[PDB]
């Protein structure tokens, strides 16, 4: 159907816009602390602590599969990156501090992404 094509065009453009948000968010992590999944080889008990791991590479796979239906889903996953880190790591660690910084800097990016998503429909 034509509707299904228009639908896919909007999903495809949502993906274009989310790709740009993801690039901007990941730019705020020059240390690449959040770039890849936490290694279950190097942290064998991680899943005892964190039930839903997340990282930027995993977000990007879902993004390119067009697996984000709206900004809220995308934001949930970003929030998992931050919140998992701030649980597993203690407050004084470079990891926890990097998550605080990423949350603070990313807040700005996501504020304007929400306006753009609403505005463009
Ligand atoms: C570069 C490796 O960094 C880490 O080892 C983790 C940072 C992200 C994270 N999320 N939950 C635990 C951890 C430790």
From Swiss-Prot:
Superkingdom of source: Eukaryota
Domain Bromo: 9-113
Subcellular location(s) per record: Nucleus; Chromosome
Tissue occurrence: Highly expressed in testis.
Glycyl lysine isopeptide (Lys-Gly) (interchain with G-Cter in SUMO2) cross-link, renumbered residues: 41
Physiological role: Scaffold subunit of various histone acetyltransferase (HAT) complexes, such as the MOZ/MORF and HBO1 complexes, that acts as a regulator of hematopoiesis. Plays a key role in HBO1 complex by directing KAT7/HBO1 specificity towards histone H3 'Lys-14' acetylation (H3K14ac), thereby promoting erythroid differentiation.
Assembly and oligomerization: Component of some HBO1 complex composed of KAT7/HBO1, MEAF6, ING4 and BRD1/BRPF2. Component of the MOZ/MORF complex composed at least of ING5, KAT6A, KAT6B, MEAF6 and one of BRPF1, BRD1/BRPF2 and BRPF3. Interacts (via PHD-type zinc finger domain) with unmodified histone H3. Interacts (via PWWP domain) with dimethylated and trimethylated 'Lys-79' on histone H3.
Protein name, as recorded: Bromodomain-containing protein 1
Organism field: Homo sapiens (Human)
Section covered of the full-length record: 556 to 674 of 1058
